[PDB]
């Protein structure tokens, strides 16, 4: 019964998915032009890059 250790499997999976989501949120834009800061700093003017 692999579900016997479910109380610990859920904890480790929650930690892993929290880390993977926190690191994946760096690829989002949140309404910006690009997810990479170096692309924004090399394609737009300072008053809009800021």
Q: Point out which residues bind other proteins (CB under 8 A).
A: 45-47, 50
CB of 49 to other proteins, least distance (A): 10
Phi/psi at 33 (5° precision): -85, -45
Query: Which residue from 10, 14, 11, 32 is spatially nearest to 22, judged by alpha carbons?
Result: 14
CB of 8 to other proteins, least distance (A): 52
Nearer to other proteins, 18 or 37 (CB): 37
Q: How far apart are CA 29 and CA 35, in angstroms?
A: 5
Nearer to other proteins, 2 or 46 (CB): 46
């Amino acid at each position: 019964t692999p579900s016997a250790l479910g109380k610990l499997q859920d904890v480790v999976n929650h930690n892993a998915q929290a880390l993977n989501t926190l690191v994946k949120q760096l690829s989002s834009k949140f309404g910006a032009i690009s997810s990479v800061l170096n692309d924004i700093l090399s394609r737009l003017d300072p008053p809009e890059a800021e």
